[PDB]
Structures are given as C-alpha cells and as structure tokens.
C-alpha cells in the first residue's frame, strides 16, 4: 500500500523564504510564516489567499494554532512571540522575555498555555490570557529547535543542537526524561505522536528516529532524505495510511511507511529546500513550503 499525493495548488505571495506552515485544527485554514516578517492565511482546500497578518519587526520561524482555530502564535527573531486574533488580524499580546531569537512555539491542547523555544537555550511557558511568562526552563546548552505538547498537555518535549531530547512535566517544569544517542548529533526537530506514546526526532545527519522515551529505545529509523543544515519539520500522517512525512534539502518531500521504514513517495516540484511540511487533520492533504529560491507553498492530495 502506497499513497499517491499529487500537486493541486501552488501558493505564492511571500517575498522571502517560507519558514513554517500549519493547518488549523478545524481543517479550514493553512497558516504560513516567513522570513518576510509576515503570516499569511490561505484556504486549506482551494488554496485561496485569505489575508496577511503583520507586526513583527523581524522574520518569523514558526507559527501555531489554538485548539479552537481562533488564535495564532508566532515566534520571531525580534525576540518576542505574538498572539494574534485570526479573524481580525490584530495582535492580542506580545510575549517578551527571551533574550535571543524565538525559534519554535506551540499551544497546549487546552490552549491556555504556550510553549516556546529559543536560541537563548531556554524553554518558556506562557499564559495565553495574560501574556505573562509562567516558567523559564534552563532546558538546553544550545539553541532549542523544537517544542511540542503531548495530547493532554501534561508533557512538553524539546530538542536542541546540544544533541538532547528532553521530556518535561508541564505543571512543575521538572525534567522527566533525557534522551542521549551515541555521538550526540544536533537534534533539529521533535514532536509527540498523536497517541502521545512515541516521539519523532530529526537529527542533522540525514536521519529521523521514532523513540519510546519512557524506555529510552529507538524503535524506527527513516533515511534517504537530506537533512544536515536546516531545522525541517516532520509529521505523522494518520488520516489514511500511517506515514512519516518530512521535507528535505534536496527540494523533495519524503513519505515513509511508519512500520516498515521504506520510502513510499517522493514529491517533486519545489525549487529550494523544503523547510516545512504539515498534514491535514482529516483529509489526506499535505502542505509543503520552501526557502529563498522558491518562496512558495504547495498543497498535495492523496487517495490514501
């Protein structure tokens, strides 16, 4: 069994490299962030451009949706995060306290909290309603490349160039687990599986690994793509077949069988590093986005 993702739309409008794309939880929208200091909102099913959201003083590396699809949070090199009302495009809050670029962000499922990771090597937990910093975790000794909540929001996973993956108790901020692996290659991305039992971690040696973090065992490895220099997003695709989806520095989208680890599809068409991919919450739809030579977002559709 293999998927047959085919290109349906190419979305243009960012004036610099795209950094991150994310589908809204209700499936209606795709949000994109860019080095051009902008967030853009597109219709998830027809690719129609909906609006531009601005206000950051420097580029944006990541963006994330609240559970009710009404809010966005963005992480910027201007050292702040911003919470945005999607319908009005207004900046509801500016979250200050990081001392270097903010690289990654995520709402918890409740969406009363935001987690952020920064080049200042820290992980911060913020109150959505007030915008105050609730906790600062000295999470790492190198820039933090990814942060993600589990499906109940009780845990946070973070990754860093220091080579570590760390699991944190959200309520207390205490580190529950540290994953070390061999010769400590930089960890460029990490996220929980939808069931919350496994973590997918990308390392800058052209490798993805699926880990059981409680036991500390790597259960799967996925290779064949190129990832040595960029923090590329990866995903579990669960709407049809159970795939692993990632971008690559060879300008392709890679799709593996989660269980067998075999490459089941390579999506051709981007003209620069595919820095970001995202999987639609209900349909077999992939969004991909690429760097300076390309600056576009592509939407792809599969029968399984």
């Amino acid at each position: 069994v293999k998927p047959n993702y085919a290109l349906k739309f190419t979305l243009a409008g960012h004036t610099k490299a795209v950094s991150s794309v994310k589908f809204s939880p209700n499936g209606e929208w795709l949000a994109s962030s860019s080095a051009d200091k902008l967030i853009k909102i597109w219709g998830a099913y027809d690719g129609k451009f909906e609006k531009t959201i601005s206000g950051h003083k420097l580029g944006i590396s990541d963006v994330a949706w609240s559970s009710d699809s009404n809010l966005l949070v963005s992480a910027s090199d201007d050292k702040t995060l911003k919470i945005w009302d999607v319908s009005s495009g207004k900046c509801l809050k500016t979250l200050k306290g990081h001392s270097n670029y903010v690289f990654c962000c995520n709402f918890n499922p409740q969406s009363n909290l935001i987690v952020s990771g920064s080049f200042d090597e820290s992980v911060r937990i913020w109150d959505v309603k007030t915008g105050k910093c609730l906790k600062t975790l000295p999470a790492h000794s190198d820039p933090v490349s990814a942060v993600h909540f589990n499906r109940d929001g009780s845990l946070i996973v973070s990754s860093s160039y220091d080579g570590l993956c760390r699991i944190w108790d959200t309520a207390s901020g205490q580190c529950l687990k540290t994953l070390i692996d061999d010769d400590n290659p930089p960890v460029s991305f990490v996220k929980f599986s939808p069931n919350g039992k496994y973590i997918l971690a990308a390392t800058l040696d052209n490798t993805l690994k699926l880990w059981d973090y409680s036991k500390g065992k790597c259960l799967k490895t996925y290779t064949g793509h190129k990832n040595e220099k960029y923090c590329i997003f990866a995903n579990f695709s669960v709407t049809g077949g159970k795939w692993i989806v990632s971008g690559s520095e060879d300008n392709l989208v890679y799709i593996w069988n989660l269980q067998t680890k075999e490459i089941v599809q390579k999506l051709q068409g981007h003209t620069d590093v595919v820095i970001s991919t995202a999987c639609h919450p209900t349909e077999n739809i992939i969004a991909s986005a690429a760097l300076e030579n390309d600056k576009t977002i592509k939407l792809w559709k599969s029968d399984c």
């Binding site: 490299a17 950094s19 080095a35 580029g59 590396s61 690289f103 820095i275 760097l291």
Partner: peptide, 4 residues
C-alpha cells in the same frame, strides 16, 4: 531565522 530558520530559513538560514
């Protein structure tokens, strides 16, 4: 920037 992630883009760099």
């Amino acid at each position: 920037m992630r883009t760099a």
